[PDB]
Design an enzyme around this catalytic site. Structure first.
Site, PDB file in Angstrom:
ATOM      1  N   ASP A  74       0.820  -1.180   0.000  1.00 36.12           N
ATOM      2  CA  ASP A  74       0.000   0.000   0.000  1.00 36.12           C
ATOM      3  C   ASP A  74       0.871   1.252   0.000  1.00 36.12           C
ATOM      4  OD1 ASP A  74      -2.394  -1.525  -0.157  1.00 36.12           O
ATOM      5  OD2 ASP A  74      -2.119  -1.937   1.962  1.00 36.12           O
ATOM      6  N   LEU A 129       9.244  -3.428  -3.794  1.00 39.20           N
ATOM      7  CA  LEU A 129       7.951  -3.104  -4.274  1.00 39.20           C
ATOM      8  C   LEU A 129       6.926  -4.216  -4.044  1.00 39.20           C
ATOM      9  CD1 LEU A 129       9.111  -1.550  -7.673  1.00 39.20           C
ATOM     10  CD2 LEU A 129       8.509  -0.382  -5.638  1.00 39.20           C
ATOM     11  N   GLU A 130       5.712  -3.793  -3.737  1.00 38.25           N
ATOM     12  CA  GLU A 130       4.618  -4.747  -3.649  1.00 38.25           C
ATOM     13  C   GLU A 130       4.252  -5.202  -5.056  1.00 38.25           C
ATOM     14  OE1 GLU A 130       0.811  -2.915  -2.398  1.00 38.25           O
ATOM     15  OE2 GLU A 130       1.687  -0.905  -3.016  1.00 38.25           O
ATOM     16  N   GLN A 131       3.494  -6.263  -5.199  1.00 39.56           N
ATOM     17  CA  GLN A 131       3.220  -6.858  -6.488  1.00 39.56           C
ATOM     18  C   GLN A 131       2.626  -5.869  -7.477  1.00 39.56           C
ATOM     19  OE1 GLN A 131       0.753 -10.288  -6.036  1.00 39.56           O
ATOM     20  NE2 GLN A 131       0.307 -10.434  -8.235  1.00 39.56           N
ATOM     21  N   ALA A 162       3.068  -2.830  -7.691  1.00 38.27           N
ATOM     22  CA  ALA A 162       3.979  -1.747  -8.030  1.00 38.27           C
ATOM     23  C   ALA A 162       5.036  -2.159  -9.028  1.00 38.27           C
ATOM     24  CB  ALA A 162       4.654  -1.205  -6.762  1.00 38.27           C
TER      25      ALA A 162
END
Ligand SMILES: [Cl-]
Ligand SMILES: [Cl-]
Ligand code: NA
Ligand code: NA
Ligand code: NA
Ligand code: NA
Ligand code: NA
Ligand code: NA
Ligand code: NA
Ligand code: NA
Length: 323
Positions: free
Chosen positions: A97, A130-132, A134
């Site tokens: 997030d 990074l999150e997925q 991103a």
């Protein structure tokens, strides 16, 4: 601050910029002071650099969470202390997030922000975590590397090695996988990669003579470590190549820290690592999500008691220096 880089093996741990996270098995991750983190964590990754409010625009930043009850000056002093001990403190860009959705042209501002934060806090580098959503958002795959090359060159001018690391989820490290633009653009700039070998459920690889080896199979954990690492360090079995001296194996600290991936029997790691060493390709270390979890409690409030660093700290730091 003073840029403090790592030349030898590493045990990397993430540090939560928040308090009292709930675990996958109902435990709790407290916020902790940096001074409390076990000294065998020689890279500590401040989590996270992110967008906090869209009114501030697209460029992510860092704000120490007031709930940690540590003043900014004291946080900076504790970084100073870590650096005096030969330990690095990175800023981790991303996380869940994070709202990082950069557009081409934003690299100059992102580089400037990174430098500003680095100079203010005394960070030693940056971890791309990074999150997925991103990984392939907007122009992230272009902007983030472009920004980091500028940062790296900026510090090189003064003889400093600003560290660049990344924490890709391992399935994105297939040949031509979604993380590969970060890795190819930053080849020669990154110091090491610490992929996440956790939270990927049953993903894994097939090996002739062994069979299907999944990240969530405890019975084949040695094989999973060995073969996934062997694949990465050689660019085989459809994985992108990450040289062994730049590969750090990322793990959950305990079963609260991640849904799957925790190593039940550390000898599975010791044996996999020794096999990699024996073939002339020793890994550079281990990483964990997270120091807070290693210092956390299970659902019944029993301390995890630093079990991860107890299991792996000596093991990793007692190895020969990388070449
Ligand atoms: Cl958490
Ligand atoms: Cl503490
Ligand atoms: Na608002
Ligand atoms: Na701002
Ligand atoms: Na205090
Ligand atoms: Na520093
Ligand atoms: Na899957
Ligand atoms: Na076993
Ligand atoms: Na080598
Ligand atoms: Na050493």
């Amino acid at each position: 601050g003073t840029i403090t880089s790592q030349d030898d093996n590493v045990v990397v741990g993430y540090w939560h910029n928040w308090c009292d996270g709930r675990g996958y098995q109902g435990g709790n991750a407290p916020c902790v002071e940096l001074k409390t983190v076990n000294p065998q964590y020689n890279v500590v990754n401040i989590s996270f650099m992110k967008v906090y409010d869209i009114a501030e625009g697209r460029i992510p930043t860092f704000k120490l969470d007031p709930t940690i009850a540590l003043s900014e000056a004291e946080f900076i002093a504790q970084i100073d202390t870590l650096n005096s001990q030969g330990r690095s403190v990175l800023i981790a860009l991303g996380g869940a997030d994070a709202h990082i959705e950069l557009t081409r042209g934003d690299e100059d501002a992102l580089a400037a922000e990174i430098i500003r934060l680095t100079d203010l806090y005394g960070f030693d580098g940056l971890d791309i975590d990074l999150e997925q959503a991103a990984i392939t958002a907007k122009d992230n795959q272009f902007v983030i590397p472009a920004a980091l090359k500028m940062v790296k060159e900026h510090y090189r001018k003064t003889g400093d090695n600003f560290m660049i690391t990344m924490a890709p989820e391992f399935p994105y490290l297939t040949a031509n996988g979604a993380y590969t633009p970060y890795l190819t653009e930053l080849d020669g700039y990154y110091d090491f990669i610490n992929p996440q070998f956790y939270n990927q459920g049953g993903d894994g690889l097939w090996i002739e003579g062994v069979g299907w080896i999944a990240q969530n199979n405890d019975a084949l954990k040695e094989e999973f470590i060995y073969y996934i690492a062997d694949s990465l360090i050689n660019g085989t079995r459809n994985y992108h190549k990450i040289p062994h001296d730049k590969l750090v194996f990322g793990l959950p600290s305990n079963i609260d820290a991640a849904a799957t991936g925790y190593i039940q029997d550390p000898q599975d790691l010791y044996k996999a690592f020794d096999r990699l060493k024996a073939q002339g390709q020793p890994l550079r270390g281990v990483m964990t999500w997270s120091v807070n979890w290693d210092m956390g409690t299970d659902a019944a409030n029993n301390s995890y008691n630093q079990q991860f660093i107890k299991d792996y700290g000596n093991f990793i730091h007692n190895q020969l220096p990388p070449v």
